[PDB]
Amino acid sequence: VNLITRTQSYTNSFTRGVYYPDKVFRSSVLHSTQDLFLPFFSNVTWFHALPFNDGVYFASTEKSNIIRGWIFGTTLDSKTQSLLIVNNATNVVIKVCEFQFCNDPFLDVESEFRVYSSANNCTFEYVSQPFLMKNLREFVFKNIDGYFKIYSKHTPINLERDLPQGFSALEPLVDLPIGINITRFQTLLALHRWTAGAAAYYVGYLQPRTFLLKYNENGTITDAVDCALDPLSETKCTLK
Amino acid sequence: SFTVEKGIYQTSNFRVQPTESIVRFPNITNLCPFHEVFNATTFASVYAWNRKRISNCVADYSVIYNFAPFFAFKCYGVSPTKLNDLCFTNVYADSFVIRGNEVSQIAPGQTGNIADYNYKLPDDFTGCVIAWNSNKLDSKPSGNYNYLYRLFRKSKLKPFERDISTEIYQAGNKPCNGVAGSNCYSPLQSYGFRPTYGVGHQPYRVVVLSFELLHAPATVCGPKKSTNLVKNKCVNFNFNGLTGTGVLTESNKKFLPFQQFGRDIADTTDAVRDPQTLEILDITPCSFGGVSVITPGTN
Amino acid sequence: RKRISNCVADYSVIYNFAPFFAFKCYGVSPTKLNDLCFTNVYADSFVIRG
Amino acid sequence: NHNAQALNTLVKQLSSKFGAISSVLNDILSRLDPPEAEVQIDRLITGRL
Ligand SMILES: *[C@@H]1O[C@H](CO)[C@@H](O)[C@H](O)[C@H]1NC(C)=O
Ligand SMILES: *[C@@H]1O[C@H](CO)[C@@H](O)[C@H](O)[C@H]1NC(C)=O
Ligand SMILES: *[C@@H]1O[C@H](CO)[C@@H](O)[C@H](O)[C@H]1NC(C)=O
Ligand SMILES: *[C@@H]1O[C@H](CO)[C@@H](O)[C@H](O)[C@H]1NC(C)=O
């Protein structure tokens, strides 16, 4: 039931992919934090099974709602548990059940038989308001110490063929205590049915880095400095 | 000295004392499923230990004492008497049946067959261990063989690592090749429990509780009753485990919907939100200072 | 009491002997004996109660 | 500038653990008992001195 052929590309990420490290309020201060971030002027992939590594930064700008949910798993088999995030019009479904995934899963639109064959043993289920809501949607996924953390941001963007230049802090969405091993992730698509369609997105990987963030008197992050980008930024970090 | 010359001297210091105490805890009315963890009538083997996670409920430890006159109740990171007021993020429970004399092997920094091949605890463990006799429950007159323990393993076990592989162990250069011949042994040994066995071999049910501190806004705390809120007075406060003293006043600080605390340049807490009613309050230290004595000569 | 010197020391036969009840090293780590260098080795062997 | 920097450093030094479980005395007092609190308290005392 394969229908999608993927073409790779490359571009510059610029200064994108900044999120709030912790839930502590600060104002009119400069704070140094060592954590997993997307490096400044990194070299991300444009797409028209992908490794997970230590975290994933996802970017999209498409309105046709072809993008909905993701699949996270090591072997993508019924032998091991896997995360399946599905966003629809009304709510969101999150399960950690050992689904028997097909080679090219996609929503039929709404039978799940093509996505997976069977449902089986599992312990976690979550339902809430759907994550999704000229528009740019950015997401950050990271699985650490028995917790899957998802951050996001939605911004209005003018007609541009690349990621914009500016600062936008990603606010926390969810922290699910799953505690399972994650190696690969796949993007879900919803084709009406078998009509042909096209979709594109940006994928980047996170690395451990030290950042210097600037807080304003309203407590919103407005500027960031990557200490390892160049000697000037190293001097700025040293002088704080 | 018994004589003082003319001048000013710094003698001591003073501080305004607190008036009362203010206690605020969340409004969750659920009861944590500690009951289902115990008295389950079926406990898994030590080599395959069940792991359960408890969150979003009020944790009461009275049923622990109401259960039985426990053989062993040992807490390492905390004090057993003060679990009634602490607040945790997540709770982990591991339950299994073990032999009587091996109970001492379950502790941080301990070696032994159960310690290295069955169940290993981290050196920074922060929790409690409970062990009680269950001879009348898990001892058949002829012998119960449902409980098994691993005996042989090539390498040691990392903390909180579970192994369920069942393959014929090879103790020499030659491979077993699917048969349990000479120098090839099964990795699992089955316990034998009979009522005629004395102390040190009868089965014991063991539950290990692990607590998670210093994480996202904690949820597992509701035993102690909350109180009202007072302002503009030197008072002691306890907000979801954050204990302190000072003066609470109204705040004009714009908290986004996901912050809980507030810090400054000196990295000290200055703002907090009430769990029961979402409202930002500023905290100021109570008055303190020094006292000087002015006197002429004693002559 | 036996003394060992002037030879290549291999500890593989130690593991090939038997599934030992107790193997405890204090001054060093058991996994790194394959690369250390010593001056003299002393061995004391006897039978004791369990 | 020197006076402000010295005062800021002295204030910021209070957040160190000095090889202890925590840098807050209230947390140690509300989570433990006298017999095992002195071991944690001594390192903080030495560092602050
Ligand atoms: C990004 O990576 C590709 C191949 O990995 C490389 O050809 C390209 O020069 C890099 N940079 C940009 C801006 O595409
Ligand atoms: C969307 O997902 C929610 C979550 O279970 C479900 O209740 C609802 O029926 C779904 N909507 C449709 C149209 O299937
Ligand atoms: C799910 O896991 C349990 C636990 O081992 C197992 O007994 C069962 O066969 C698995 N599959 C299904 C469909 O329940
Ligand atoms: C996850 O997958 C990796 C590689 O497939 C494996 O080594 C690991 O044991 C698995 N589980 C965990 C908890 O990492």
Ligand SMILES: *[C@@H]1O[C@H](CO)[C@@H](O)[C@H](O)[C@H]1NC(C)=O
């Ligand atoms: C900062 O907060 C003040 C007070 O609400 C507001 O008037 C001002 O517009 C804010 N500045 C921003 C959001 O840049």
Ligand SMILES: *[C@@H]1O[C@H](CO)[C@@H](O)[C@H](O)[C@H]1NC(C)=O
């Ligand atoms: C557990 O179950 C037994 C019966 O199986 C019951 O007598 C007891 O009250 C229950 N609760 C506790 C805490 O033992």
